[PDB]
Every structure is written in structure tokens, then in C-alpha cells.
Amino acid sequence: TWSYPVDPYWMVALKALLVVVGLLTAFAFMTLIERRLLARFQVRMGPNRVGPFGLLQPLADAIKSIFKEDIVVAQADRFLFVLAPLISVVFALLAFGLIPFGPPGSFFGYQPWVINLDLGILYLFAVSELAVYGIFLSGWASGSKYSLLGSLRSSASLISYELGLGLALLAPVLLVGSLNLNDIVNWQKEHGWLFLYAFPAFLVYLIASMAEAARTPFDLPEAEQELVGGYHTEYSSIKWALFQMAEYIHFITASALIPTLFLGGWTMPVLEVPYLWMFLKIAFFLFFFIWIRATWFRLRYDQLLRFGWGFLFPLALLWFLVTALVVALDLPRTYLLYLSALSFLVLLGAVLY
Amino acid sequence: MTLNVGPQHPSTHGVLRLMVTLSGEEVLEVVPHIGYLHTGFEKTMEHRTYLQNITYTPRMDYLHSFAHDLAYALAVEKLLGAVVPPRAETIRVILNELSRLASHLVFLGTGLLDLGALTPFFYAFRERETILDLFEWVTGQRFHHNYIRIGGVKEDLPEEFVPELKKLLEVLPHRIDEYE
Amino acid sequence: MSLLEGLALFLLLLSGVLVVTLRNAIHAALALILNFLVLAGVYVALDARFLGFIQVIVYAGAIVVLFLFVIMLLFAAQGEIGFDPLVRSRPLAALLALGVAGILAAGLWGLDLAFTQDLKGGLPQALGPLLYGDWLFVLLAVGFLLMAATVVAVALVEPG
Amino acid sequence: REGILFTTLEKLVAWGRSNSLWPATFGLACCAIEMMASTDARNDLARFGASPRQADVMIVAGRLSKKMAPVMRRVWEQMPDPKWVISMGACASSGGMFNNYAIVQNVDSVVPVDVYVPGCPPRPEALIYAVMQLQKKVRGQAYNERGERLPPVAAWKRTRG
Amino acid sequence: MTLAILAVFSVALTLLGFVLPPQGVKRATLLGLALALASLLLTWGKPFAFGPYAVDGVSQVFTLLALLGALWTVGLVRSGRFEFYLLVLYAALGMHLLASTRHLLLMLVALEALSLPLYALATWRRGQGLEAALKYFLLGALAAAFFLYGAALFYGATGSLVLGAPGEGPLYALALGLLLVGLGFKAALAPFHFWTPDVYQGSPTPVVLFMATSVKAAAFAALLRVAAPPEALALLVALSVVVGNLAALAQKEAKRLLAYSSIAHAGYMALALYTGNAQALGFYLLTYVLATGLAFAVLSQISPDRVPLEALRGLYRKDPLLGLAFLVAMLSLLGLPPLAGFWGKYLAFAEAARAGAWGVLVLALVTSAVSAYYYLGLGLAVFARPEETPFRPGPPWARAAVVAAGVLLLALGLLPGLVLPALAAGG
Amino acid sequence: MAPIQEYVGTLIYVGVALFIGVAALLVGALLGPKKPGRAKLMPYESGNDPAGEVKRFPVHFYVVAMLFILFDVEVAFLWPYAVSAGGLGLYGFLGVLAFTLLLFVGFLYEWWKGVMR
Amino acid sequence: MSYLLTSALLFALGVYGVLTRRTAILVFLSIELMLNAANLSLVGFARAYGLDGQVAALMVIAVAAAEVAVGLGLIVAIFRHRESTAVDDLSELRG
Numbered sequence A: 001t002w003s004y005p006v007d008p009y010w011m012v013a014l015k016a017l018l019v020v021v022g023l024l025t026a027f028a029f030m031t032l033i034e035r036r037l038l039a040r041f042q043v044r045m046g047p048n049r050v051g052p053f054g055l056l057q058p059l060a061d062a063i064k065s066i067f068k069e070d071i072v073v074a075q076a077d078r079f080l081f082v083l084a085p086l087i088s089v090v091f092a093l094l095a096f097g098l099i100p101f102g103p104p105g106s107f108f109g110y111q112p113w114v115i116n117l118d119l120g121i122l123y124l125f126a127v128s129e130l131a132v133y134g135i136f137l138s139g140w141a142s143g144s145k146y147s148l149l150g151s152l153r154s155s156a157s158l159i160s161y162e163l164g165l166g167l168a169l170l171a172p173v174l175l176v177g178s179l180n181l182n183d184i185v186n187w188q189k190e191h192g193w194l195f196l197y198a199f200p201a202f203l204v205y206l207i208a209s210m211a212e213a214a215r216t217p218f219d220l221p222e223a224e225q226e227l228v229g230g231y232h233t234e235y236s237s238i239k240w241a242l243f244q245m246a247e248y249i250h251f252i253t254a255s256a257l258i259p260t261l262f263l264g265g266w267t268m269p270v271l272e273v274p275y276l277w278m279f280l281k282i283a284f285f286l287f288f289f290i291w292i293r294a295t296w297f298r299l300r301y302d303q304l305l306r307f308g309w310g311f312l313f314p315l316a317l318l319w320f321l322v323t324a325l326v327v328a329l330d331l332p333r334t335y336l337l338y339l340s341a342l343s344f345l346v347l348l349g350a351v352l353y
Numbered sequence B: 001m002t003l004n005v006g007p008q009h010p011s012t013h014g015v016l017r018l019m020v021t022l023s024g025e026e027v028l029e030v031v032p033h034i035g036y037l038h039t040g041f042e043k044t045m046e047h048r049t050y051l052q053n054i055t056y057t058p059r060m061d062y063l064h065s066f067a068h069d070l071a072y073a074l075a076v077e078k079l080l081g082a083v084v085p086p087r088a089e090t091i092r093v094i095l096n097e098l099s100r101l102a103s104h105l106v107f108l109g110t111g112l113l114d115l116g117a118l119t120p121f122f123y124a125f126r127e128r129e130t131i132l133d134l135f136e137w138v139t140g141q142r143f144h145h146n147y148i149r150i151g152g153v154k155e156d157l158p159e160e161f162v163p164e165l166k167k168l169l170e171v172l173p174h175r176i177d178e179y180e
Numbered sequence C: 001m002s003l004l005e006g007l008a009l010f011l012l013l014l015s016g017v018l019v020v021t022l023r024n025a026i027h028a029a030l031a032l033i034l035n036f037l038v039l040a041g042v043y044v045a046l047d048a049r050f051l052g053f054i055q056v057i058v059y060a061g062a063i064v065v066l067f068l069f070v071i072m073l074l075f076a077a078q079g080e081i082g083f084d085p086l087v088r089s090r091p092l093a094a095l096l097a098l099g100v101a102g103i104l105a106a107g108l109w110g111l112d113l114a115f116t117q118d119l120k121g122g123l124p125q126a127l128g129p130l131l132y133g134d135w136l137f138v139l140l141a142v143g144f145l146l147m148a149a150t151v152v153a154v155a156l157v158e159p160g
Numbered sequence D: 001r002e003g004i005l006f007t008t009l010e011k012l013v014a015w016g017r018s019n020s021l022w023p024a025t026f027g028l029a030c031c032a033i034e035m036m037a038s039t040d041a042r043n044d045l046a047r048f049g050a051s052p053r054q055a056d057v058m059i060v061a062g063r064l065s066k067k068m069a070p071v072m073r074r075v076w077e078q079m080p081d082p083k084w085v086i087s088m089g090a091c092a093s094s095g096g097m098f099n100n101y102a103i104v105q106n107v108d109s110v111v112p113v114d115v116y117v118p119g120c121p122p123r124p125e126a127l128i129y130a131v132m133q134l135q136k137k138v139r140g141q142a143y144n145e146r147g148e149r150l151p152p153v154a155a156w157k158r159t160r161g
Numbered sequence E: 001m002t003l004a005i006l007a008v009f010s011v012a013l014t015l016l017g018f019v020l021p022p023q024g025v026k027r028a029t030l031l032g033l034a035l036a037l038a039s040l041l042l043t044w045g046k047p048f049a050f051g052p053y054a055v056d057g058v059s060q061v062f063t064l065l066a067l068l069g070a071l072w073t074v075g076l077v078r079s080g081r082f083e084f085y086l087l088v089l090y091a092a093l094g095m096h097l098l099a100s101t102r103h104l105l106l107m108l109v110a111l112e113a114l115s116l117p118l119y120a121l122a123t124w125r126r127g128q129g130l131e132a133a134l135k136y137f138l139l140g141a142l143a144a145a146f147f148l149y150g151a152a153l154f155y156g157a158t159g160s161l162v163l164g165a166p167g168e169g170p171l172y173a174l175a176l177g178l179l180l181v182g183l184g185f186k187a188a189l190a191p192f193h194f195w196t197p198d199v200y201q202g203s204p205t206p207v208v209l210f211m212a213t214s215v216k217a218a219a220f221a222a223l224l225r226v227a228a229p230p231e232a233l234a235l236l237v238a239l240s241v242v243v244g245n246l247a248a249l250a251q252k253e254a255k256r257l258l259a260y261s262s263i264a265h266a267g268y269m270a271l272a273l274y275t276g277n278a279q280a281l282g283f284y285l286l287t288y289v290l291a292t293g294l295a296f297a298v299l300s301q302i303s304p305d306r307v308p309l310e311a312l313r314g315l316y317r318k319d320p321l322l323g324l325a326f327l328v329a330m331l332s333l334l335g336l337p338p339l340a341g342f343w344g345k346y347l348a349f350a351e352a353a354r355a356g357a358w359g360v361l362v363l364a365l366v367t368s369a370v371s372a373y374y375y376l377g378l379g380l381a382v383f384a385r386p387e388e389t390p391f392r393p394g395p396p397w398a399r400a401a402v403v404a405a406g407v408l409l410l411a412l413g414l415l416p417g418l419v420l421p422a423l424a425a426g427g
Numbered sequence F: 001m002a003p004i005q006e007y008v009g010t011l012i013y014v015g016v017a018l019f020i021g022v023a024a025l026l027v028g029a030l031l032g033p034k035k036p037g038r039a040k041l042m043p044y045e046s047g048n049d050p051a052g053e054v055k056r057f058p059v060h061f062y063v064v065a066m067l068f069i070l071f072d073v074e075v076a077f078l079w080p081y082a083v084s085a086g087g088l089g090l091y092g093f094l095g096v097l098a099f100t101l102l103l104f105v106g107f108l109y110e111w112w113k114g115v116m117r
Numbered sequence G: 001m002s003y004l005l006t007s008a009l010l011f012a013l014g015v016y017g018v019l020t021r022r023t024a025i026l027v028f029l030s031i032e033l034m035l036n037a038a039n040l041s042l043v044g045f046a047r048a049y050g051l052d053g054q055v056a057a058l059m060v061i062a063v064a065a066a067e068v069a070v071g072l073g074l075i076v077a078i079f080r081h082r083e084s085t086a087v088d089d090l091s092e093l094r095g
């Protein structure tokens, strides 16, 4: 925050609240869109009933949800069962704040973000650990071990790739030289589109985000069809809704973060209207990810650990040292345009034999 | 960990109960426990006419039912020494194999879903729907069709069955390949 | 400063008291997590910021999660089992606790320091040249310590 | 608070639930495969949970064996409260064509039935008719042949215990 | 650049042992350690500092000793796990680092480096060895906490985490105390001694050789670097020697007895700490390390798990040379002439009296006479009629090792005017 | 650096989020039927025992966690270099490389031994 | 300055824990709390003496992590087969 202003604490608050409830309506309507987009992929139709577009069905659903009877299991730790859903949502919502959707002053006088800070990615990392805390904790809190085991599979896997995200994030930091999202973005304004320079790390970041419930590992798990996922399976009315809510906000936070960092989110080469583009990129990754949600198999997490731990993460720190070598010896930043382009040429061509 | 995979949950398919003797992520031994669907045909059917039984035959394997129909019809015909007409036999091979395509379509639909992911249940379901529409056309029923008879079959095929079997016989080669 | 400062330090001590008091291990560890949050906050207020963030990430995020995995993997939540309580020790344990504060209190009493240097907030930006720099050897030694740690920890388990 | 006591509020929540009616399927025989067809065409329903915990509507689809009864019992009990039971097909509803030692001759013995759906198997669209029934049943829009209006939730009427 | 050699071999053998038979790895680790010692001799009089890392006469002598101990302990251990070598390698570097710096925090990291791999070396997995390992880790990490808050308080009273910083009144005093706690625990001075009886008895004997030589060496090496005041010194000495010898009297078991005895011995060496002569202390530890290394090599040739006192008996008849050597070790550890142990003791006592601390010196000496009870209770026990006892009479490796060590002992008993001329600058 | 001013905004953000979450819990808890019975409270699957009795768990989760602590410490150290890097020159890079390779030897060890286990 | 005093207090608390706790693990945690007391004091004095105490503390955190990994490994090995940990359950080694 060398170059960027601060709105008064009341306005920071108000913006925070707007972003939270905005994220509420966001998650619900996103559930509708994925329902139907999936329906198109599998050549059926969505829910038009309880319409008009079918888009009043989160009202109906939320309405079921509350008035549903929130059940607290005995044989569940009384304090932890309640507290668990609380944690998972709190640490999910926060840190979508940081993401700038526009230049300063452009919020109608103020600030497209909520908070910016000076240490950016670390905040994200920090908040990311704590949701997982919520996961394995709920697994305990429920005090059904069937729930536990799954929560443990979950946590082990998540934590694995969660490590992956860091060594992913190292490379682009070298180039920009800042821990701030606005600076990274602006770096992409001038030198342009970090994934041009950073590509392998782009790959390992994205796929690292597969672990965080994104689908294609999925021995996350959802309880479905396996040794269950754990955390949900013991909760009913509001609390269950809270867990689902958190996992989805994380999904869109990631769909925002991917353009924000490696691409130029907002801050596109041309047109450069402030909000619309970040929402569009969000939409792009969101849709592509939904395709991923539908159209690919599971890992078992035996493999998922193999894939992230054995493949993604070593690959991640390998590229870091390369970009470290390049930035340390100051050569040009061109060598990374060339290198990333070339590595992309490799990591693609070996698919089509 | 002798893990108890329940009767109907969690997605251990078709109401089986499994005592997975299992420590860790492997599987030591699963001690299977059945009997949850026991309807008791072998007794009930001792109380039904040989004709009446033909309504109870499709009902066990409900996916490939006509194999039940065929097996039972045959064993009785043999036992009472009946002579099945060629066109009936042909229709019975057609229906048997069509019911087979239905069953198989189901098997791989569920299989692909069971571990792995959701999408291809639907295409198999589309082809199965064309098959079930064939069955409805000829027998008036989706399944459990009371059609096969100890003589032969209940009645003849309507005008519209032939054209529709072709349609599916046309898409299926391309179609089966798509699943493949 | 003092308005909230009192509050934050109070929360620290309270949390510690919990982690040493509660005979629910999970509750304990969790109280220590709360502790690490507040402590990281205080670190930042104290112009050490990066150290705060690594405090949360590693200490809170990683370490105590491994702990939690251990106590969840082994139960032990109800620590007080099988006893040898030797109750005459609890006040004696509590006694000794008071003394180690007293001696430190004395050494820090009548101690005034210049808590004024322009640290510029303990961002890794200015910390890096110390790390690879004056502390680089300490660093490499540490790294070696970690490597030895991983192999130790591995051979330590490694049923065969 | 169970969806009740403001003319605006209860109606509002009651639509919420009816249109939200959240089937938790309890497959048994061939009827379950006839409900897997229903999964295709569906549009207030067919998201699940699947886990019982998360759902209002229990769909009993197939022959319920006597050995199987105490199980379905707890699954029903282990559901949140505002919950409904649809009974699918002859075997479930009455004893069906299997009248014998093996099978429950009405599922209403073990779980409070809200709606019944005849057929062997019933066409899926009949089950839509039944969930529209139950849709419109929990709206308190439902009547029997005697003239009586029907309660939104049966199993608000049994004594638990 | 002995450090170079150490880091290199450890890191390399780590992955190498995947591709090597465990014996090949043993051959390797052995080779590495011996090479590092070679570099130590070729650098005598060549003192070298890099980072907080610093090699001088002290570092040189004390890691000469430590390296010697590591080689001897690896000699005995034939287990077909390449790690049971690797850990020793790690530990050795860790001890080198500990002796080689004034940086409190680097000292901390070095402490973890040496101490963590010994915890794992505590497992033959015999039921005691887990108890031993446990007590060791818990008390160890506790002391870690202490030395760390100590470094923080040193940085507290003064601008540096490096020792020798000018120093305050009471806060400085406090900080030096908090460093003295951990550094003292590592050396088995009383009343920090409680682990010593349990861990020596619990851990497999050869490992204990390694500990009881190398660890004590490195620990005194780092101790000399600290500024410790006379009164505290008095206390530690008094308690160590008293409880050490007195409780050693009560000992029925060779290893445990040796533990208590070693508490008394740390007590004796702590006198050199009065002047911190280190030519004197260097010498003392030369003599002690040789004798003790010997003693535990023999206790290894009896049994890895536990040795009772009677087991030592009749050892002369069985093997004459080992009986004699064990005897000599008992006498050198007694501090009796004409053995090098007497000159080490004398050098410490000389520095003590030089510092003008009399009562302390006296008590140390009196209870040092107390120690002769068990020292002869072993050394002479060699000659009694052999009872039923386990004996595996070694390779040439062990026979030539033990005898060599003894000979080196008595050689410097008669001619300390050989090595003592340079335990100093290295002339 | 950057102001303290924004961080207080972060505290704000936390307060707002926490408040909204608690409000959600309050709506859930307050608006429901409520009917505790022995049957409802009881864990899962009709005659129960899904969890059953198990004597603890695979250590695999422990291993993943311990791995994670060490590698995360690695990253915690790698971050300060990643920022000032071209600033620390070739020798900086060489130090960071030393450290990195050290801990990578660590990872490589535990891999070739592996934790299928 | 309040901070240094509180760090000392925390150290004390961790002490109370270590002496009190019946189980191994909670002892270890109390130890961890002590270690952090140290780190905080380091931070205060870093702000006083210029920032080397900070790097110190970082290295410390790393140290702590290593010994945490190792120590939990040992805690697991000692009572994996064995039943409830309570540290008094091992008395075999006596003077």
C-alpha cells in the first residue's frame, strides 16, 4: 500500500458487508447456473419449475433450509459440533476482499477492494489453512468416525496440494517483486499477462486448486459413492448449508484468483472497463471448471497425493529456481516469455500423439 | 477398523450390507451380508398357476427380465412338451437381446458413476429409453412385461415396432462406440 | 496502544492459562491456536509482521494441525486416565510455576529500553538480506537440521 | 418454527418446502430403477441428501423385506423433522403380488405414509404426480375422498416414542 | 572446511544408501568421519572462521575428541539399516557446529542438530529403550525452550545474540543463567543429572559410548564460550560431585553406575571452567574421552542392552588385554597417577585453585576420593572368579581399538609434555 | 511498507464476517421443529455402527502433516528470498539454492522410501 | 515492555502445563508455548535492538518445527501399540 489510499473504517466495513452478502447471493445463483450448465452438458434440461427461469428456487431452498430443524447430535462434542460450521464459512468469505476489480477511486469515489494490505498471498494462504481446520475438526466434532476418516483423507489431500499452491506462487513474485495483488496486476498491465512469463507455475497453481474440492480429485471427498467425505453428513438445517456455502465461495474465490494473478484480471490490454472483465474471467474459469466438475473422473487420493506430491510440487519448486536464476541474474524478463512459451509447447504436444 | 458399509448407505449399490474388515486404506476381507431383498418367490410360485408364474418371472432380475421369462417358459414347455413357433422364437431372441442391451446400458451407466463421475449415465439412459419405448410398444409395459407364454408369446408385434427398432439399431453402432 | 493492548495481552495470558488448564486435549491445542492468532497480531503491532504471518501459517496452520492429527489419530482427548495423580504435586507444580515468573520479572524490573528503532514493519522485504546474509549460515544449518529432521522422523516411524 | 403462525410467513415457508421438497430415495427393488428414470425429468427435485440428514422426503421404492424394516425405520427417524414419506408401487403400498412371510404388507406399518403411488412399477410421471401431490400436500392444498383436507406432514402424526 | 566434508557425506549418503548395501554405507560413513578428523590434524595451528561458524584451537581439540568417539561407536554397530549410521553422521556435524560458534541461535540450531538424531539412536526398541528415548526427548525439548529464552534474554540485556557482548547487571545475569541451564543439562551436571542414569541404562551400549564421549566433549566446548560466574560454578560442582559419587555408590549396574560417575566427572571438569584454560580442559577431555570410549567399547562387547557389575568380573581370565584396559580406564577415570586422567584432573584442579576457589575444590576432591570405591569395585572386579556371563570377543577392530586407546592414555600420563605443549595455539 | 491503517480494516472485515455467520447460525437454531428422540441423535445407518469400534487410524495423515510442516517451513524461508532476489544477486541465489537442494534431498529420501505406508 | 513481561508469564504458564500434564502430548504442547514466549521476547528486543531478534525468532520457529516433527514421531512410536500414554506408565528405570 505504497501507492493506494484507505477508506474510513466505516466504509471499509460497509464494503466488507456488501462483499459478504454479495457473496451470498453469488453462491446461490451460481448453484443455479451449475445445475443448468450441467444439464446442457448431459443433453437434458434444468429446473424451470418454481421459476420464472427457475431462479426463485434458492428462495424456496433457503426457505426449506431454515425452518428445517437444526439438529445437534448427542455423541458429538457439544461445543465443537456447533463451532465447526462457523469457522469454515468465516475463513472462506474473508480474503476475497483483497482482489482488486478496478483502479483506485473507481468504486464511485473509493475502492474496488475491501482490504489490500502489503503482504498479500500470505493472507490468502493463512485463511486457506483455517477452513481445512474446520473440515477435520467437524470430522471430530460430529464424533462419528465414518465422518472422521473421510475428513482425514480430505485434510491430508487438501493440505498436500495446499502446500503445492505456495511453491506455485513463488515464481510470479520474483517477477513483480511485490506481495500485493494490485502491483502484480499492474505489472501485468505493463509487461503483461504473467502466465506468459510464469506458465508452469500457472499449471501447478490451477491443478493445486483441483484439490480444494474443485472436482477431479473428489476423494476430497463428497460422502457420495465412497468412504464418505466428512464434516457434512451429520448436520441438518443452517449448519449444513454453511459448509456447502463455504466450499462454493472457495470455488469462486479461486475462479477469481486465477485471472487476478497469472492473467491480467480486470486490467485487460484493451477496453479496460474496470469490473466487467474480472467478472467475465471469473465466469470463464467458472464455466470451464464446471465442465471439469461434470466431465472427469476421481483420483482416490492415493493417486491424488501421488500426483500433487510426487509431480506437481517438485515441478513447482523446480520452475521457481529457474525463475529465481533469471531474476537474480537480472537477464531479461524475455527469457521467461520464451521459457514459459516453450514449456507450454512441450506440456501440450505430448498429449496428442 | 472393521468398517461397516450399511444396507443402502453410503452408495453401496442395491441394498447390500458389507463388513469390510479393513485397517487403513486397503481391504483385508469383506464379509458380505445379504438377504435384505428376500421376497420368497420359490414359495409364492408354488402357489401360482404356470401361467400365473409368468408374471412373477420377469420380477427377479428386473433388468434382464426376459431371460427369466425365456428360461421359465422353456423349462415348462419342455416339461409339458410344447412346440414353440419360429417367429415367436425369433421375437424372443430379439426381445431377449434388446432387454440385454437395456440391462447392460444400465450396468455401465451405474458403473461409470459409481467411482469416477456422473455424465455418461445419461446417454446410456437415452438409448435405454429408446429400448423401453420398444418394450412398451410391443408389450404395453416398460418391464415385468407379461408377454412370453408357455406356448409362445402373448400377442403379435404392432406395425410400429419394426421401424423403431431400426432407428436404435442405426444409432447404436455409432452410439456404443461413443461410450467406448 | 494501551486501550486495546491491555485487551490483547490479557487474551494471550488467558489463552495460555487455558492450554495448560483444560484436560480436553483438543480444547487445549485449540486454545493454543487462538493464542497463536493473538500473538501474531501482537507481533504485527510490534512492527514484526512477516514473522506474524509465518507464525500463523507454520505454527498455527501446520504444526498444531499435525498435533491435532496426532490427538485425533490416537484419541487421548481425555488425557486424565490411569492416573498416578500424586495430587500433592499439583500445588507444587503450581508453586514452581510462580517462581520462574518471579525471577524473570526481577531481571526485567527496573529495566528500561529504547524500543525505538525504525524497523519499518518486519516485512520480509527488509528481512531477506538478513536471512541470506548475516544469518545465511544459521539458515543453511537450519535447513540441514530440517533434512536430518525428516530422515530422523522417517526412520523413527518406518515399521518393518 | 415448523413453518407456522403468520398467514404470510407460514404460506411463504410452506411454498418454500413444497417446491423445495428434497427426496431422499430409499431404493428397494425394480421400483428404484423406475425412480432412476424420474431423476431425469426433474425440476424441484433431484438433488439429494444420499445422506438422510439433509432431506424432507423419503421415497420408499420397492418391496420392503421384513428383515429390512427396522433399518428403514431408523433411516426415517434419522431424518430431520419436517419430513414426508412417499410410498412407491404395489409391494410398498400394500403387500403387492407377493403376499407372504417375506415382505411387509404395508409400509405404513413402519413409517407414516404421506402419499401412495400404485403401479408395478409405476410410470415415473405418476411419481411426479405424487410429488406434486406432496408438493401441493404440504401447501395444505390436499383432500381425501371423505371431504377432509390433508395435513402437510404425516409423521407430524405418529407418537414417535 | 571440515564442515564441508561433514555436510557433503551426510547429504550424499542419504540418497546413496538406497543404492548401496547397508555394509557399503557403513564403510562410507566410517570413511567420512575419519577424513574429517584428518582435516582437523592438517589444520592444527590453522584456525578458520566463516559465518557465526568459527574453528579455533578449542573447536579443533574438542571436535578431534568428538570425531574420535563417533568413529569408535560406528565401528561396533553392524545393523543392516543404513540410517543407523546416517543419524550418527548427522549428530556428529551437529556437535561440531555446537562447538564451533558463539552465536546463541546458531548454537540453538546446532543443539537441535546434534540432539534430535540421538533420540532415534536410543532405539534398539527394547522396552526400556523407548522409555529412555521418551525421557530424553521431553527433558531435551524443555531444555531447548530454556536455552532459547536464554538467547532471547541475552539479546535482551544487550544488542547481540553472539556471546561476549558487554553485559548488564541483573538482566544479563539472568540471561547468562538461562543459557547455562540448557548448556549445563547437555553435560550431565547435577541437579540436571536425572536423565543420565535412565538414558545410559536404557539405550543400547555402543550408542551410549557415542553419547558419553562425543556429547560431553561438545557440551564442555560450548560451555567454555559462556561467561559463567564463580558462585554458580561452586554450586554445580558441589552437587555434581556429591550426588554423582554418592548415588554411584548405590549402583548395582555398570552403565548406570557409569552415568552417576560421569556426573561426578562433569563436576570435576567444571572446575577448569573457573579459568576456562582449555589447554587444561582440552587435555582433561582427551584423557577422559579415551578412557570412557574404551570402557563402553568393552561394555558393548559384553551386552548391548545392559551390563551388571558382576558381568565385568573374571574379564581378565577371559581376555587379559581387555581386563587390563578396563582397569586402566577405571584408574584414569579415578584420576590416579601415572595416568593422563591424573593430568587432566590436575589441570582442572590447578585452574580451580588458580582461580582461588578453595572449599569447592576440596569438596570436589573429597568426593572424588569417594569415587574410588566403585572405580576399584570395577577395575579390580576384573580379577575375581568369572560368573556366568555373556562374552563375544570382538573383531581385531575392537581389540586393537581398546588397547590403542589405553596406550594413548598412559602415554600422555607420562608425557603430557608432548600434546600439552600444543593444546594451545598448536605449536 | 504499507500503513497500519489497512490492517485495522482487516480486523473490521473479520468482525463483519463473524457477525454475519453467527446471525446465520441464529436463524438456523431459532427456526425449526425441534424433536429430540433417541433414534434421531444416533450416528448413522439403521442398526448403526458405521464408525463402529476402530483402534485409531492410519499414520498416513500424520505423515502428510509432518511433510507439510517441513516443506511449509521451506516455503516460509523461500518467501523472503523470492521478494529480494535480483537484489541479493548470484550469491543470494546460490544460498537459496543450497537450502532448497538440502530440503529437496529430504523430500527425495522419503519418496524413494515413500508413504504408501 | 509489557510484551517482554507477558512473554515471561507465558513461559511460566507453559511450565505449569509441563509439570501438570499427565499425557506426553500436552506436555509437548506446553513446551511449544514456552518456545513462543521466547520468540515474543525476541521480537520486543528486536524492536529495541534492531531486528536481528526477529530473524532469530524465525530460525527458532523452524527449529521448533523440526523438533515437533521428530517429537511427534517419537510420541507415536512409543504409544502406538501401547495403550493410554500417561507418562507415569513407564517406571522401569529407577536409580
Ligand code: SF4
Pocket (backbone or CB within 6 Å): B059, D028, D029, D030, D031, D061, D062, D063, D088, D089, D090, D091, D092, D096, D119, D120, D121, D122
Ligand atoms: S411394485 Fe412391481 S416394480 Fe415395484 S418393487 Fe414390486 S415387483 Fe418391482
